[PDB]
Amino acid sequence: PQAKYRHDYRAPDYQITDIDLTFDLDAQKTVVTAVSQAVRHGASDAPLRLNGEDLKLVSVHINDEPWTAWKEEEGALVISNLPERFTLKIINEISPAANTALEGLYQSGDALCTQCEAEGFRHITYYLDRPDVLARFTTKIIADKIKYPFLLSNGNRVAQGELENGRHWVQWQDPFPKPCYLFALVAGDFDVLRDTFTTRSGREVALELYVDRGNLDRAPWAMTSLKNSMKWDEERFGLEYDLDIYMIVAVDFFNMGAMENKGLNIFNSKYVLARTDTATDKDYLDIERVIGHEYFHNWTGNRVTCRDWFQLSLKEGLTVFRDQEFSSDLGSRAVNRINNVRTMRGLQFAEDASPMAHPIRPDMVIEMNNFYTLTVYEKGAEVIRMIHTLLGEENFQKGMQLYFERHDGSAATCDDFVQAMEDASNVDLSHFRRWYSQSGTPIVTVKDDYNPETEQYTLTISQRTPATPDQAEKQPLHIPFAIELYDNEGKVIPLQKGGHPVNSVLNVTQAEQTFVFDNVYFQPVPALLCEFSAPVKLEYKWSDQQLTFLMRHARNDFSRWDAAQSLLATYIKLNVARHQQGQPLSLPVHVADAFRAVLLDEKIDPALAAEILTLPSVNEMAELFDIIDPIAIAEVREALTRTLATELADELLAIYNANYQSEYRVEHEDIAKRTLRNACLRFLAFGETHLADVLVSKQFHEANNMTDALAALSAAVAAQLPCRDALMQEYDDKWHQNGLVMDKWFILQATSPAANVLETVRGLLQHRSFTMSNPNRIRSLIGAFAGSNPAAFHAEDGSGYLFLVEMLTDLNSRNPQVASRLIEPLIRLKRYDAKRQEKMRAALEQLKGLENLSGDLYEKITKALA
Numbered sequence: 001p002q003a004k005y006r007h008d009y010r011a012p013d014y015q016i017t018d019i020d021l022t023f024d025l026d027a028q029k030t031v032v033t034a035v036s037q038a039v040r041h042g043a044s045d046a047p048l049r050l051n052g053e054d055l056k057l058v059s060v061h062i063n064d065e066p067w068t069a070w071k072e073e074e075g076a077l078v079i080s081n082l083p084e085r086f087t088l089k090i091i092n093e094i095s096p097a098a099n100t101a102l103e104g105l106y107q108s109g110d111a112l113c114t115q116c117e118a119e120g121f122r123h124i125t126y127y128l129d130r131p132d133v134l135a136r137f138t139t140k141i142i143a144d145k146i147k148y149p150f151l152l153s154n155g156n157r158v159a160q161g162e163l164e165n166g167r168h169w170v171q172w173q174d175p176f177p178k179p180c181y182l183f184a185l186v187a188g189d190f191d192v193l194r195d196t197f198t199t200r201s202g203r204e205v206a207l208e209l210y211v212d213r214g215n216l217d218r219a220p221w222a223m224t225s226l227k228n229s230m231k232w233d234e235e236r237f238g239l240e241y242d243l244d245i246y247m248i249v250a251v252d253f254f255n256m257g258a259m260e261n262k263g264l265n266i267f268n269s270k271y272v273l274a275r276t277d278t279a280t281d282k283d284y285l286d287i288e289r290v291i292g293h294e295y296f297h298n299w300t301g302n303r304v305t306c307r308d309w310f311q312l313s314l315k316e317g318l319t320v321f322r323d324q325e326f327s328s329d330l331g332s333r334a335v336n337r338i339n340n341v342r343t344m345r346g347l348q349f350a351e352d353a354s355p356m357a358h359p360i361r362p363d364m365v366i367e368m369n370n371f372y373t374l375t376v377y378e379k380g381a382e383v384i385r386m387i388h389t390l391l392g393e394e395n396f397q398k399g400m401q402l403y404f405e406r407h408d409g410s411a412a413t414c415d416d417f418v419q420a421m422e423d424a425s426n427v428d429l430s431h432f433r434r435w436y437s438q439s440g441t442p443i444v445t446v447k448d449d450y451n452p453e454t455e456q457y458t459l460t461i462s463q464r465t466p467a468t469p470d471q472a473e474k475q476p477l478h479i480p481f482a483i484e485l486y487d488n489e490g491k492v493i494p495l496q497k498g499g500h501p502v503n504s505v506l507n508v509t510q511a512e513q514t515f516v517f518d519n520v521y522f523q524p525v526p527a528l529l530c531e532f533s534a535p536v537k538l539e540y541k542w543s544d545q546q547l548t549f550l551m552r553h554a555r556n557d558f559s560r561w562d563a564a565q566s567l568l569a570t571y572i573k574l575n576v577a578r579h580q581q582g583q584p585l586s587l588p589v590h591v592a593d594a595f596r597a598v599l600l601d602e603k604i605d606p607a608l609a610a611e612i613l614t615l616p617s618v619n620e621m622a623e624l625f626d627i628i629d630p631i632a633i634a635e636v637r638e639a640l641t642r643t644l645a646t647e648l649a650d651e652l653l654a655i656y657n658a659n660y661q662s663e664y665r666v667e668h669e670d671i672a673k674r675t676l677r678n679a680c681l682r683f684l685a686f687g688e689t690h691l692a693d694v695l696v697s698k699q700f701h702e703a704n705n706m707t708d709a710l711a712a713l714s715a716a717v718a719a720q721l722p723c724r725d726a727l728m729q730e731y732d733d734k735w736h737q738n739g740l741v742m743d744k745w746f747i748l749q750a751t752s753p754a755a756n757v758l759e760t761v762r763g764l765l766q767h768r769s770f771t772m773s774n775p776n777r778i779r780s781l782i783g784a785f786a787g788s789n790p791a792a793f794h795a796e797d798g799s800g801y802l803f804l805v806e807m808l809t810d811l812n813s814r815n816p817q818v819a820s821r822l823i824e825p826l827i828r829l830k831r832y833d834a835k836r837q838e839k840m841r842a843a844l845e846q847l848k849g850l851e852n853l854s855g856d857l858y859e860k861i862t863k864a865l866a
C-alpha cells in the first residue's frame, strides 16, 4: 500500500454540488442510489475518478444515459468523456451485516448506523471521498417499519411515506454543504429522550437523544451536558447552533469515542450512558467532555472543514482545546490542566519518540485512520493553547472571529487558521508555524544566576529537539516560556528590566538566549514553564527545598502539583536504579514530610491535594527513562505507595474519614472531596493488611455510587487484599449483563499485579460478558493488558507479546482500526532492553507475514522494523 503526501495536494478536477441518496435498507443487502450534480474544473480530457471500496456496481448513468466510457480499478471507478456539467447516477449494493470493520454502513446490535470519517463514505457509494468536495445532501431511507421504525439522517425531515409489504420511508435534507465524512444514517428501534434548547438570539432547537430500549434511565446527564455545551459555546465563543434539531444516537459498537456528523452525532454509548450506580465521577466528566467536543465541532470542523486529511489538527487540535476550556470553565481548571499535562508527558511524549512520530500536520500518511493520534489531538491542542498564551483571550477571540468570517462554508488549512490569528492580533506567528511541521518533543534547558551586587537574575535558556525517525533535521521553535519569581516569603517579585515591566511569558526563539531581570531584591525561587506553557521537557537543576517551597507557596495550583512531580521524579529514578541492583526503596524523610504537609494543609483545595497524592502512572514514570524497565517501574510504584502508606498512616486515615460524604452529587466540590478521599484509600490499602482489608471491603459494600465502589475494588486488586476474589465475584454476579460496567472489571483484571494475570486474561476471552466483536470489550481486556500493564505485557518470557500477536492475527481481518490501536505497545520496542527488543521484533516480523495484512498494521509494522 502506497503513501500519500501533503505536498501532493491539488484541487479536484471535478466538484459535486448536490447529491440525492436513496437507501433501500436491509442488513444483508442494501441498495444505494446516488444522484450527484457535478461540475468539471480541470482539463476537458480529465476523467472523473471516484473512490469506492467493496461496492457491487449495478449501473452508471450520465444525464440519464447508460454510460459506456468507464472502468473499475482498485479502489476506484474512472468515468471518461464527460460534459462540463452533468448529473451522475450510480446504483450499487453493499452488505451491512458483513461489515465487521465498522467503517461505512454497518450493524450495531439490531440497529444500522454509519461511520464515514475519514474515508468511510466510499464504502457506501462511489464518490469524491475527500473533504474539500462539499455538497448539499438529500437522503431518502426505505426500510422495514417493524425492524426500523426510526430512520434518521442529517438535517430535517422533508418527506415521509408508507409502502406496501410493511416498509416505510423518510427523506431528510441538510441545507449546509458538507464533505461526505460528515454524512450519517441510523435505522433502528430506540427509546428517545427529548428536550429543547433556546439559543441566545431565540432559535428553538429540538434535542433528541436515541438510546437502546431500556436505557432512558441513563440518558439525562448527556442531555444536560449537551445543553451546557450549547450555553458555553455561546458565552465563551459567541457561537450558536445553526439548525432546528440536534440528534445524538448512542451505539454499542463503535471504533472511536464519538462523531460530529452534522445534526446527527453518533456516539459510543460509553460516552453517553451514565447513572450513579453504573458510572464513576470520571465517566460523568468524560461524557461531559465528549458531548462538548462533538458539539464544538459544529463550528470547528463542520461550518469550517478541512481541505485535506493532513489538516486534521485544524479541527481536532482546536476542538480539543475547546473541550478542555469547557471542562476547565465549568469544573476545576487546575485539575483539568494537571490531567491534560499527565496525558501529554506520559502518553504523547512516548508517541513523539516512537517510530510513528509525526508533526501535528503530518507530511506522509499510508492509512489516515492511523493519524487520529495523541499528537494530532493533544499536542494539537497544546499548540492552539500556545497561540492563546501568546495572544491573550481578547486577541485569540478576534482571531477566531476572523477565521470564521473568512472561512465559513469552506474547507480550510492549518495555515489559514494561523494566518487569521496573526492578522487579527498583529502578533507575528511566522516562526510559530514551525510547530505544525516539526515532530518530536523539545528539551528546554535552563540555568540561572543571581547577582547580589546588581540585584539581577539571569536565565540562560537553551532548546533542542532530538532527531526523530521521520525527520533528521530539527530547528528551534517559538516557545512561550512562562515564569514567576518568588521571594523568601513566597511573594511574587515583579518582573522588570531597565525600569519597565517585562511580560512573564518569555519568547524563547533561539537555540540559546539569556534573559536578565533587574530589581530582583531577593535571590528567587523560580516557577518555570508555568501551566505547562509549552509542550516541552524542562531540564533545570532543582534543589529539593526549592520544590517543597513551590509546593507550599506557588500561586497557581498547577505549579504546586508540578513541583511535586519534579520532587518525585528524582526519587523514582533513584529507586528504579536501586531495584535493578536488588536494593529496597530509599526516600529522604523531608520528601515524606512534604506530602504529609499537603495532607494536613487546611487551605489547599482538596482537588489539588488529591492530584498531588495521586502518584504518576507507570506510563508517566516510563517517560523519565531512556531505556524502560517496566518491571522495576511497577515494583517501585508499589514500594513507594507502601512507604508513604506506612509513613503517613494516621494522617491518611484522618483525611479519609474527614472527607466522608453521605449524599452523592455530581458537583465539583463533592467530586474533589471524593477524589481526595479515594486517593487516601489507595495508600491505606497498601498499609497494614487487616485495616486495609476492613476499610476496602466496607467501602465496597456500603458505597452508594460506582465511584466509591470501584475505588475500593480497584484497591483490593492493586494491593492483592484477602477480600479481592470475593468482591470481584460479587461485581461479576451483579453486573455481567451490562457491558459498560463490565469494562471496568475487565480493566482491573487486565491491570492486576498478580503473577498469573496473563492466564486470567486469556481465560476472560471466554467470559460471558466478553466478545471479540465489540471494540469496547477488546479495549477493556486486551488493550488494558498490553497498554496499561507493561510489567506483564513485558514479562521476560515473552508471553505478553505472543498473546498480543494472536489477538492481532484475529483483529487484522476482523477490525483493522482496532488492531492498529492495539499494536501500539509493540511498536515501542526501541525503548526496551536488547532481549525484549529481540522478542518484540520477532512478534512484529510474524505479523508482517500475515496473509491479507491490513494497510493499517502495515504502516506501523514497517516503521517499527526500520
Ligand SMILES: N[C@@H](CCC(=O)O)C(=O)O
Residues within 6 Å of the ligand: 117, 118, 256, 257, 258, 259, 260, 293, 294, 316, 372
Ligand atoms: N472526528 C471525531 C472522531 C472520528 C474518527 O476517529 O474517525 C472526533 O474527534 O470527535
Ligand SMILES: N[C@@H](CCC(=O)O)C(=O)O
Residues within 6 Å of the ligand: 618, 633, 634, 635, 637, 638, 639, 641, 682, 683, 718
Ligand atoms: N497500584 C498501586 C501501586 C502499584 C503499581 O502501581 O505498580 C497504586 O495504584 O496505588
Ligand code: NA
Residues within 6 Å of the ligand: 015, 016, 017, 132, 133, 134, 135
Ligand atoms: Na462542491
Ligand code: NA
Residues within 6 Å of the ligand: 018, 019, 020, 136, 137, 138
Ligand atoms: Na441534494
Ligand code: NA
Residues within 6 Å of the ligand: 327, 328, 329, 330, 331, 332, 333
Ligand atoms: Na472552573
Ligand code: NA
Residues within 6 Å of the ligand: 367, 369, 855
Ligand atoms: Na482502511
Ligand code: NA
Residues within 6 Å of the ligand: 422, 428, 429, 430
Ligand atoms: Na508573520
Ligand code: NA
Residues within 6 Å of the ligand: 447, 448, 449, 450
Ligand atoms: Na544557578
Ligand code: NA
Residues within 6 Å of the ligand: 448, 541
Ligand atoms: Na538554581
Ligand code: NA
Residues within 6 Å of the ligand: 562, 563, 565, 566
Ligand atoms: Na515536573
Ligand code: NA
Residues within 6 Å of the ligand: 615, 637, 641, 682
Ligand atoms: Na499509588
Ligand code: NA
Residues within 6 Å of the ligand: 765, 766, 767, 768, 769, 770, 771
Ligand atoms: Na463471551
Ligand SMILES: [Zn+2]
Residues within 6 Å of the ligand: 293, 297, 315, 316, 319, 320
Ligand atoms: Zn474531534
